[PDB]
Design a binder for these strands. Sequence first.
RNA 1: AGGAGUGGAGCCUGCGGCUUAAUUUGACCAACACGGGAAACCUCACCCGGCCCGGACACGGACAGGAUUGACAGAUUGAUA
Length: 108
Amino acid sequence: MDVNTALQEVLKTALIHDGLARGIREAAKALDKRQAHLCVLASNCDEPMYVKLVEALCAEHQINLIKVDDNKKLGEWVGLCKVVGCSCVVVKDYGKESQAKDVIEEYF
RNA sequence: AGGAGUGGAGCCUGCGGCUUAAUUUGACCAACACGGGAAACCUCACCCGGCCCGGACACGGACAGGAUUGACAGAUUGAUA
Ligand SMILES: [K+]
Ligand SMILES: [Mg+2]
Ligand SMILES: [Mg+2]
Ligand SMILES: [Mg+2]
Ligand SMILES: [Mg+2]
Ligand SMILES: [Mg+2]
């Protein structure tokens, strides 16, 4: 039960329950709205202001953050599949509690 | 054999012609108050001008580092499209 597998399962559940906000604009709106318990970041993105703003907003809202490696893999996980490639995700809510969610909380 | 008429008058209404941006069009005993057709808009088919897609689905491309949607004001417009 690796943290990668836990993230994949929780993202799949959130998408199936429509609790996922993909993209930097949607993620920023969800974070500023005092919602969206968790956030996922991709280390592949080459834009420095991107990661700077993502981390600054996440820290200001005081919510968990995860830095995954590949933007394309993150997009394929969040369900943009040819994969567009998501470089920042937000979990507005989880559909149902699961062992993957528990593992993510423990990693937090 | 007759009665009431029509054809004459004014008007209503349909048809041709003429005119027009358009005067939408069908029909010439068995067409012409016929299309149940008494049209201000709609009807609308015609003319002038301006929005919209309400172009399914398939394939390909562009895309969450955003494909795309809508919009306040001021110009613009017949118009608060
Ligand atoms: K007469
Ligand atoms: Mg007469
Ligand atoms: Mg006969
Ligand atoms: Mg009338
Ligand atoms: Mg009319
Ligand atoms: Mg009209």
